[PDB]
């Protein structure tokens, strides 16, 4: 099975960058990252675009890695509270703090809705 090999390989790539990552929860292929400017009231498209990995670290904290295929700089963020993630229109809006907002666009809308649910269920106690 192709997925067994893919997941094993991907986990080693993730662990090379972030040794504290314990497992991959789910994946989405073509994700683009946007950042919200607070004072300007405007969105900015970042240089980060690639494969999205929803992950768990050694302390079961939930987060995500975007492996940037364009440039070597990747992104690893935690999802600290389920209420910090909102499915707004075609985007996942992740607000870790009032002034610190990121937006994720996934090519496949089915990935966006599945990932939203998996985020919530991964944080469910």
């Amino acid at each position: 099975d192709e997925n067994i090999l893919r997941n094993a390989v991907n986990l080693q790539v993730l662990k090379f960058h972030y040794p504290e990552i314990e497992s991959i929860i789910d994946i989405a292929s073509h994700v683009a990252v946007y950042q919200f400017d607070v004072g300007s009231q405007k969105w900015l498209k970042t240089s980060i675009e690639g494969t999205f990995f929803l992950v768990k670290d050694q302390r079961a904290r939930v987060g995500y890695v975007i492996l940037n295929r364009n440039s070597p700089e990747n992104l690893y963020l935690f999802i600290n509270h389920p209420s910090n993630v909102h499915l707004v229109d075609r985007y996942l809006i992740h607000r870790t703090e009032n002034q610190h907002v990121v937006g994720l666009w996934m090519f496949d809308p089915n990935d966006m809705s599945r990932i939203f649910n998996i985020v919530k269920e991964s944080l469910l106690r």
Binding site: H30, Y34, K42, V88, R90, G103
Partner: peptide, 14 residues
């Protein structure tokens, strides 16, 4: 491919 940043919502909460 990915939409222009201007297409993203600035809802009440944002």
């Amino acid at each position: 491919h990915s939409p222009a940043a201007s297409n993203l919502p600035i809802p009440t909460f944002l």
